[PDB]
């Protein structure tokens, strides 16, 4: 199989569910027992990313950071050391308005490599999306970190996330480009 | 009056109230009608800072950033341009439950110069404290920015905030040093 590149946007704005994605199909797929299903490679929920490995599934998944922020510079693919998913805090319900919010969370599996490591309130650093500071107030910045990501069957995608909101600034609409399979 | 320097720690961990402080007295003072009370100069709430001016009070207060991060470098005191408090989102209740929480907000006066400008999720930038990237997860970091701050009567303090939590990591326990009055 030759390396195919696709740019994908997925609406992961809902808090209650994840959007499951197949590298080989290039499509969102329906998943009803994610921990025992090899038909998905990566899942998205808000700014969280899950892989089919570790605490999130029974597959051969995992992820590394290439050290690059340009996909065209990440040309050597590692053969080992694809860190697997761990448990962390996921927001599963969020009600908000001008006067307050109420939220609920669950401990679930996710990829710290891609998501970043979370603080006690679930905000993350070191992955695809970072807090950024400037005089107009803090924003999210795309880190542009380029990941290598094993899918459920172990074949590797090169993945870079490039947006976290749509053109109307609806948050949790995620865009990424991936090239798959690579070796 | 000669310039006096004091290091102060105030427990501003409660969400429901502000801690009001007098520069001249070097002490916390009790305040109810804060918008009509010249006996306070600076108030603390969590990581928020309020001055007796603008949307927060009828006084002659306000603030500037000196451009310095060392108090001993901020030796020329501006005579004009002390920005006054504006309205923004203040968290006035936080209630934890076993698997989630609830927060309530109010729009109140605060100093953007010292607090930082807030985004739509309430994170501030450009003031004394910034929620920021790190390899173990995101954390608040001290900017060490040195401010000049007019009190209610217009007399100026040099102020630098140097901690946001106590030794047990209790959040919202604020340490600052100030020198007052300066000209």
Residue numbers in the entry:
A (entry chain F), B (entry chain A): 34 to 216
Q: What did the publication describing this PDB structure actually write?
A:
P. gingivalis is a heme auxotroph, therefore it must acquire this compound to survive and cause efficient infection establishment. Amongst well-characterized heme acquisition systems of P. gingivalis is that encoded by the hmu operon, comprising HmuR, a typical TonB-dependent receptor involved in heme transport across the outer membrane, HmuY, a heme-binding protein, and four proteins with unknown function. The work presented here substantially extends our knowledge of P. gingivalis HmuY by presenting data on further structural characterization of this protein and novel data on a second member of P. gingivalis HmuY-like family, Tfo produced by T. forsythia. The comparative analyses of HmuY homologs suggest that not only the HmuY hemophore-like protein of P. gingivalis, but also T. forsythia Tfo may be engaged in heme acquisition.
Our crystallographic studies have revealed a unique β-fold in the HmuY–heme protein structure and confirmed bis-histidine heme ligation. To further characterize P. gingivalis HmuY, we successfully solved its 3D structure in apo-form. Compared with holo-HmuY, one can see the opening up of the heme-binding pocket in the apo-form. The loop containing the axial heme ligand, His166, has moved significantly and the His166 side chain faces the surface of the apo-protein (the His166NE2 atom is shifted from the heme by approximately 16 Å). This loop must close up when the heme group enters the pocket. The opening up of the heme-binding pocket observed in the crystal structure of apo-protein was reproduced by MD. We experimentally verified that heme binding was accompanied by a movement of the loop carrying the His166 residue. Previously, using UV-visible spectroscopy with a single beam spectrophotometer, we estimated the Kd of heme binding under oxidizing conditions to the HmuY protein to be approximately 0.25 × 10−8 M. Here we carried out a more thorough analysis using a double-beam instrument and found that HmuY binds heme with Kd value < 10−9 M. We demonstrated that P. gingivalis HmuY not only binds free heme, but can wrest heme from methemoglobin directly and thus functions similar to typical secreted hemophores, which are engaged in heme transfer from the host hemoproteins to the outer membrane receptors.
